[PDB]
């Protein structure tokens, strides 16, 4: 119990505000604790709670858009 | 044919391109994007409210703005 974390190579995100769309859609999935996205290194980092979130649930929240997300911590 | 016009907050080309993959979840849809005008112009036998809800999966200000 306590903070869990993972990295997801969002290979469809890089420009200006695909980046911002992640922080909108992730930040309202109750179990998230801290989101970070890297636009030139083309990846997405997050700290989350294990009672309320999972790496599988992160891959569902990117699938609300159209970005080429693969788990890679 | 039901050519309907919708406008969505395309602050980015990736932020826009997402509309293609969510409309492909419905599949039975025809659509064409204008990145400067911020428009997606659609025709499907599915309802305007199905299309609007599907676009709003992409996390933005989306407004239905009438007919061509
Ligand atoms: Cu972008």
Nearest to A44 by CA among B3, A64, A20: A20
Domain annotation for chain B: domains and CATH numbers: 1-68 (3.30.70.100)
Question: Torsion angle, CA of B38/B39/B40/B46, rounded to 10 degrees?
Answer: 120
* Cα distance between residue A16 and residue A50, in whole Å: 31
CB atoms within 10 A of CB A72: 12
Q: Do B14 and A17 touch (CB under 8 A)?
A: yes
Angle at A41 between CA A40 and CA A46, to 5 degrees: 115
Q: Do A15 and B13 touch (CB under 8 A)?
A: yes
Give A31-40 contacts, CB < 8 A, sequence gap 24+: A31/A57, A33/A3, A37/A10, A37/A13, A39/A13, A39/A14, A39/A15, A40/A14
CB atoms within 10 A of CB B44: 18
What approach was used to elucidate this structure? Answer: NMR
Domain boundaries, chain A: 1-73
First to last CA, chain A: 19
Among partner residues A13, A16, A21, which is closest to B59 by beta-carbon distance?
A: A21
| The CATH classification of domain A1-73, taken from the options 1.10.443.10, 3.40.50.300, 3.30.470.20, 3.30.70.100 | 3.30.70.100
Q: In what order do the strands lie in the sheet with B62-67?
A: B30-34, B39-43, B4-8, B62-67
**DSSP codes of every residue in A1-70:** ---EEEEEEETT--SSSHHHHHHHHHTTSTTEEEEEEETTTTEEEEEE-TTT--HHHHHHHHTTTT--EE
Chain B CB contacts of A67 under 8 Å are 14, 18
* Cα distance between residue B67 and residue B37, in whole Å: 15
Chain B CB contacts of A21 under 8 Å are 12, 15, 18, 58-60
* Cα distance between residue A58 and residue A46, in whole Å: 9
CB A42 within 8 A of CB A11: yes
């Amino acid at each position: 119990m306590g903070v869990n974390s993972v990295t997801i190579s969002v290979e469809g995100m890089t420009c200006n505000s695909c980046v911002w769309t992640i922080e909108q859609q992730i930040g309202k999935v109750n179990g998230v604790h801290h989101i970070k996205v890297s636009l030139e290194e083309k990846n997405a980092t997050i700290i989350y709670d294990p009672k309320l979130q999972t790496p599988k649930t992160l891959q569902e929240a990117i699938d609300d858009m159209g970005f080429d997300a693969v788990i890679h911590n | 044919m039901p050519k309907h016009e919708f406008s969505v907050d395309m602050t980015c080309g990736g932020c826009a391109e997402a509309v293609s993959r969510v409309l492909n979840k419905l599949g039975g849809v025809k659509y064409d994007i204008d990145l400067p005008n911020k428009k997606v112009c659609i025709e499907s036998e599915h309802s305007m409210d199905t299309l609007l809800a599907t676009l709003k999966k992409t996390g933005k200000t989306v407004s239905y703005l009438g007919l061509e």
